[PDB]
Design a protein around this ligand. Structure first.
Ligand SMILES: *[C@@H]1O[C@H](CO)[C@@H](O[C@@H]2O[C@H](CO)[C@@H](O[C@@H]3O[C@H](CO)[C@@H](O)[C@H](O)[C@@H]3O)[C@H](O)[C@H]2NC(C)=O)[C@H](O[C@@H]2O[C@@H](C)[C@@H](O)[C@@H](O)[C@@H]2O)[C@H]1NC(C)=O
Ligand SMILES: CC(=O)N[C@H]1[C@H](Oc2ccc([N+](=O)[O-])cc2)O[C@H](CO)[C@@H](O[C@@H]2O[C@H](CO)[C@H](O)[C@H](O)[C@H]2NC(C)=O)[C@@H]1O
Ligand SMILES: CC(=O)N[C@H]1[C@H](Oc2ccc([N+](=O)[O-])cc2)O[C@H](CO)[C@@H](O[C@@H]2O[C@H](CO)[C@H](O)[C@H](O)[C@H]2NC(C)=O)[C@@H]1O
Ligand SMILES: CC(=O)N[C@H]1[C@H](Oc2ccc([N+](=O)[O-])cc2)O[C@H](CO)[C@@H](O[C@@H]2O[C@H](CO)[C@H](O)[C@H](O)[C@H]2NC(C)=O)[C@@H]1O
Ligand SMILES: CC(=O)N[C@H]1[C@H](Oc2ccc([N+](=O)[O-])cc2)O[C@H](CO)[C@@H](O[C@@H]2O[C@H](CO)[C@H](O)[C@H](O)[C@H]2NC(C)=O)[C@@H]1O
Ligand SMILES: *[C@@H]1O[C@H](CO)[C@@H](O)[C@H](O[C@@H]2O[C@@H](C)[C@@H](O)[C@@H](O)[C@@H]2O)[C@H]1NC(C)=O
Ligand SMILES: *[C@@H]1O[C@H](CO)[C@@H](O)[C@H](O)[C@H]1NC(C)=O
Ligand SMILES: *[C@@H]1O[C@H](CO)[C@@H](O)[C@H](O)[C@H]1NC(C)=O
Ligand SMILES: [Ca+2]
Ligand SMILES: [Ca+2]
Ligand SMILES: [Ca+2]
Ligand SMILES: [Ca+2]
Ligand SMILES: [Mn+2]
Ligand SMILES: [Mn+2]
Ligand SMILES: [Mn+2]
Ligand SMILES: [Mn+2]
Lengths: 238, 238, 238, 238
């Protein structure tokens, strides 16, 4: 049996147990600011990621076991002009050596808009900009090896309000669930789908966040993570 | 600071840390069978409840603090005829000395269909029968001091399939959230609302489940709870 | 699998999730005052206990499993005259319906000084008075069904200083361990012994504290518990 | 507030969330074999370490807070000839970029036998060989920036028997406590000392194990870690 757990109710200025990639910084309020802000305004063409430093053991070939996990986090997206929001934020799992990929609508996750099993990426996206591969309207998606989500639901942005997300994986049913609640408006969203982590991901992964602002100067928004908890448990075989 | 936590991944016979009320028994598979089964068939006019034995400290007048909690559970409803499903299951919080009330559509929670502040009940119902006070169709509801829910959403019962429920209370925003997922069909539901526990409930409560079958012989279903976790935390004052 | 867990970093004035027996009260500083204090002075012939309200599932005959547990607590004993300290404090496990027994050197645990398998008591005692059955000097003891400890070690009371205790049970080796640290003086103690909980105790028990002041007017001391954490885990069968 | 937690009840063959240094391997039984075994026999001049991959946040200069931690582990030392046992095993905290130092009696921890504040090492040693700087006999020691322990106690190696260790740090009293139990014989040991982590260590450290066999061919023993749990909590300021 193996377990891994961590809690941040805020982030400290030089978080050595996070691997910060691209533009990410920690703000003086203790938030993970994934995309750049200059003089109070979000900057275009920005991409940042943040991963927990330790690999997570999500399945074991030696014992044929697969882990459960539950992660919770709070985030804020603030678009000065809601009609020109872009591009969004994702929680993801990836190989341990993962590096940022293309900005904009590919969210730092993928090098192109195609499906590739060797990406070894599972993500939950909060997608604020309609690309050519996207459904109509802002949406939450489950992504497996592609920016073209396996499943999406409609999601209405409450601009500059705190969103509370919970993502869980139940190995026994191969089910990934993602929910988002805005306590400020009493609105909530949820979806789930079958995702077989043992078939998709390597035995060890890194987990974390990515976000990107739009690739034109007027399509900007912030992507800040305020708090994050993660728990995983890899059971003994039966 | 106080915390309380428990996990049941299955239930034992004569569970001395549960207060079983009405018809509830534990099955040989280790499930909490809230309503009666005779020769493999659900019995009508059955009502059963199950509460954790220890009171939970949900707020403290001495320090003016209010607890957070998160509970998860799995349940199954099996109706021989899905169109004549009745009456449903609820998770609830109530005064420590709570006793079962009326069966059928009142779900063992209430003595009548009226609102009364002295009930001191907060419940999340999974309501399988349209009573005269109900919205159209099967629904999930947040109930405060009445069987007439404060808020409902539509929910389609997946007959004899496992439902995974998560109910959480965030004291800082006075927000109660309930979600339900069916991993078998990849279907999911969520709602939330403002419920001020400090104004509604006593400082200590008991928490648990109630369920009732229909009050006519053809409106029957089982209500089984398979697993249950609960965690609460009452913080120090600021 | 079943788990039970709780934390008190201090105690609130009417703790409804504790079963208080005999003289126990909660002080305005939020301590569990097990033996009586009148006008700042400890009272003789006082006995008090405090149990967690929910029974703990320590073994299961259905699945042939036995629980691990770990408990930590902080306590203070203040004897106005250290040479006339009596009688001490214990942590214990007992049947669910346990009631206080004889005061003084029997510590509220036992009706007499004999061994009896039907007592179903396991205790760790902090014994400040030499009875006829006691080793020389103040001592920590592991007690099983008798006030005559199975094993003792010497322990010097540091008067009115906080003691930090950890008691743990490892089912796989049938080993109970108890340690005490005084951080103020950098002094520590530890012992362990074989106790087979499945053979000694019922499937469910209550857990908590007991303490008694001396049975003569000049042999008095306080017995206060400042904080308490408990965790138990009853595993699935192999 | 930040917390970090992990559990290994056994180790899997390529543990990517551990940083293995020197000779360490994982055995087919799932043990961390810190020093080399060849044809069933321990090899001399062997040094191995194993660190958890993620840095641990032990204090924060921004908020002036200091973390608590508790770690537990099980280990076995098997010396073919008990009279020629060498050199031992330690649990330690060190800078994030820590690398193995000198083998033998310096335990991979130190470059020499001198005290140096820039080492930034806190360790608990299980020392099986009397060096020139050591007390007489096998001992447990608390070491701060030197192989010359601040405090030692006598400890008798129970050859090839499982030892259960618990090491804890209480920030409010600056107290480090270490205990060892052999459940097979019901023998136990404990010591504690004041160690100010904020003054000794950097804000982030890595934690883990080191062990070394003797520097002559006949002074050999195994050093195997069977299981490890770690929990740390960095509180919010007052
Ligand atoms: C599907 O995704 C896989 C896995 O990422 C892609 O294969 C990998 O592509 C990398 C380039 O993005 C290769 O690494 C590079 O190797 C060169 C030469 O040694 C280095 O100079 C450079 O810095 C990189 O490290 C990597 O070797 C390769 N992995 C495997 C297992 O083959 C794959 O990319 C496509 O196919 C491979 C074979 C190459 O032809 C790539 O250039 C090409 O993009 C992805 N497939 C698609 C359609 O995107
Ligand atoms: C039209 C324009 O002004 N800028 C657009 C730019 O078009 C040009 C202009 C000049 C040259 N060139 O050869 O120098 C090449 C391309 O090409 C980008 C690729 O489609 C547009 O990127 C999109 O920007 C959107 C916000 O406007 C979102 O960020 C959206 O996700 C993003 N699309 C992707 C796939 O990332 C970008 O807006
Ligand atoms: C008509 C009949 O056969 N049975 C009906 C029953 O009738 C009688 C007839 C005589 C006597 N008596 O005291 O003599 C008592 C009751 O009165 C019940 C109370 O109104 C009907 O209860 C409803 O039954 C439904 C399923 O049919 C649902 O369970 C529904 O929630 C439930 N309603 C409530 C409010 O709980 C029940 O259907
Ligand atoms: C010596 C004395 O004054 N009183 C003693 C009293 O014996 C008597 C009996 C009758 C009368 N009488 O009024 O006829 C007067 C005195 O009998 C008790 C034995 O049953 C003594 O109890 C012991 O007191 C000690 C502190 O003094 C410790 O608490 C010690 O644990 C306790 N012993 C036990 C077993 O609990 C108690 O002190
Ligand atoms: C073969 C032999 O005698 N090797 C001995 C070795 O000798 C030499 C010979 C030449 C040179 N040189 O600088 O060239 C250096 C060392 O000197 C080592 C430093 O004193 C002995 O190390 C000690 O060995 C002991 C077991 O015998 C323990 O492992 C003990 O902890 C260990 N001592 C230390 C401080 O690590 C080691 O036994
Ligand atoms: C063990 O405890 C009980 C009290 O809890 C005593 O009553 C027992 O006495 C024995 O059993 C009782 C019922 C009675 O038959 C008596 O004659 C027995 O001695 C006691 N057992 C012993 C051996 O002391
Ligand atoms: C409901 O309110 C009425 C007074 O209007 C009261 O008589 C009754 O006791 C209340 N219900 C309870 C306590 O369940
Ligand atoms: C103290 O330690 C540092 C690094 O561990 C080292 O570079 C330095 O030489 C040491 N100082 C001495 C030996 O005086
Ligand atoms: Ca998009
Ligand atoms: Ca209804
Ligand atoms: Ca005594
Ligand atoms: Ca040595
Ligand atoms: Mn999308
Ligand atoms: Mn309803
Ligand atoms: Mn004694
Ligand atoms: Mn030493």
């Amino acid at each position: 049996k193996e377990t891994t757990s961590f809690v941040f109710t805020r982030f400290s200025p030089d978080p050595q147990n996070l691997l910060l990639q691209g533009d990410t910084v920690v703000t003086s309020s203790g938030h993970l600011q994934l995309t750049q802000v200059k003089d109070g305004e979000p900057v275009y063409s920005s991409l940042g990621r943040a991963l927990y430093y330790a690999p997570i053991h999500i399945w074991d070939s030696n014992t044929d076991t697969v882990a459960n996990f539950v992660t919770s986090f709070s985030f804020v997206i603030d678009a000065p002009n809601k009609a020109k929001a872009a591009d969004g934020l994702a929680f993801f799992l990836a190989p341990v050596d993962t590096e940022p990929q293309k900005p904009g609508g590919l969210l730092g996750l993928f090098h192109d808009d195609r499906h590739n099993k060797s990406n070894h990426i599972v993500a939950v996206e909060f997608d604020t900009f309609k690309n050519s591969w996207d459904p109509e309207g802002t949406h939450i998606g489950i992504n497996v090896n592609s920016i073209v989500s396996r499943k999406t639901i409609s999601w209405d942005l409450e601009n500059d309000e705190v969103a509370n997300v919970v993502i869980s994986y139940q190995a026994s049913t191969k089910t990934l669930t993602a929910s988002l609640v805005y306590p400020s408006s009493s609105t909530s969203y949820i979806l789930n789908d079958v995702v077989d982590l043992k078939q998709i991901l390597p035995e060890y992964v890194r987990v974390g966040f990515t976000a990107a602002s739009g690739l034109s100067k007027d399509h900007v928004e912030t992507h800040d993570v305020l708090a994050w908890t993660f728990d995983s448990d890899l059971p003994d075989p039966s």
